[PDB]
Amino acid sequence: ELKRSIPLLPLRGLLVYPTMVLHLDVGRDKSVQALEQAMMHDHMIFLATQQDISIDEPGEDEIFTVGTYTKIKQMLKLPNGTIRVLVEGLKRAHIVKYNEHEDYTSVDIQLIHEDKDTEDEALMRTLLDHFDQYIKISKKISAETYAAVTDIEEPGRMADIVASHLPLKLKDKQDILETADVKDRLNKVIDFINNEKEVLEIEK
């Protein structure tokens, strides 16, 4: 099944699956044009993740070929010229023709099909069990960690140890190591925790 001339929206550091519903804040000129172009027609767009998160104008080489045929549900034009859109993934599809225009990129795609056994039911039971084991195990580990860190009397040592358990990029951990001053170190770690807390709430 073929869909011609679908406006392309390259995602950075984010992947949308069919049936997922989320808000997106769009700013790249060529991305807001793609949105605006879709709203002038059937409200459909093609979301495809960029491979290199640092590129601002990705060519076909820099986007994955398979992505998600998507529906714009609500679109809001912000003060600054940015757009806040609510989208819903519908179907997976693959780029089959790349129409790079001046204002935005457009793409021809072919919808991909799948598609409930009694095997499938077992596998789901297994998926849920392992997922639950993994949730249970994180909860258990992090608790033991909180209790260990609780009994630490030295500020410098508490800042280091708490930093070593947070999901921080290495360069951030290195920053902590490179912060000799204990008060400065504690502050940075507190701040890191806040970011990690805010990021969690963002992804939800």
Give me the DSSP letters along 121-160: HHHHHHHHHHHHHHHHHHHHHHHHHHHHHHT---HHHHHH
Q: Which of 43, 100, 36, 97 has its CA nearest to residue 70?
A: 43
- DSSP SS3 for 54: coil
Q: Do 112 and 94 meet the contact criterion of CB atoms below 8 Å apart?
A: yes
Does residue 125 share a domain with residue 107? Answer: no
Query: The domain that contains 46 carries what CATH number?
Result: 2.30.130.40
Q: Domain count of the chain?
A: 2
Does residue 66 share a domain with residue 121? Answer: no
Does residue 194 share a domain with residue 120? Answer: yes
Rounded CA-CA distance 145/151 in Å is: 10
Burial class from Cβ neighbours inside 10 Å (0-12, 13-18, 19+) for residue 126 reads: exposed
Final residue belonging to a domain, choices 78, 112, 146: 112
Does residue 123 share a domain with residue 88? Answer: no
Q: Which domain holds residue 66?
A: 1-112
Q: Which runs of E-coded beta strand occur in the chain? A: 2-11, 21-26, 44-49, 66-77, 83-100, 105-111
Q: Which of 28, 8, 31 has its CA nearest to residue 106?
A: 8
Does residue 26 share a domain with residue 85? Answer: yes
Does residue 103 share a domain with residue 56? Answer: yes
Query: The domain that contains 140 carries what CATH number?
Result: 1.20.58.1480
Rounded CA-CA distance 157/110 in Å is: 56
Does residue 189 share a domain with residue 129? Answer: yes
Final residue belonging to a domain, choices 86, 112, 138: 112
Q: Do 69 and 94 meet the contact criterion of CB atoms below 8 Å apart?
A: no
Q: Please give the structure tokens belonging to residue 110.
A: 């072919």
Does residue 136 share a domain with residue 79? Answer: no
Final residue belonging to a domain, choices 64, 97, 112: 112
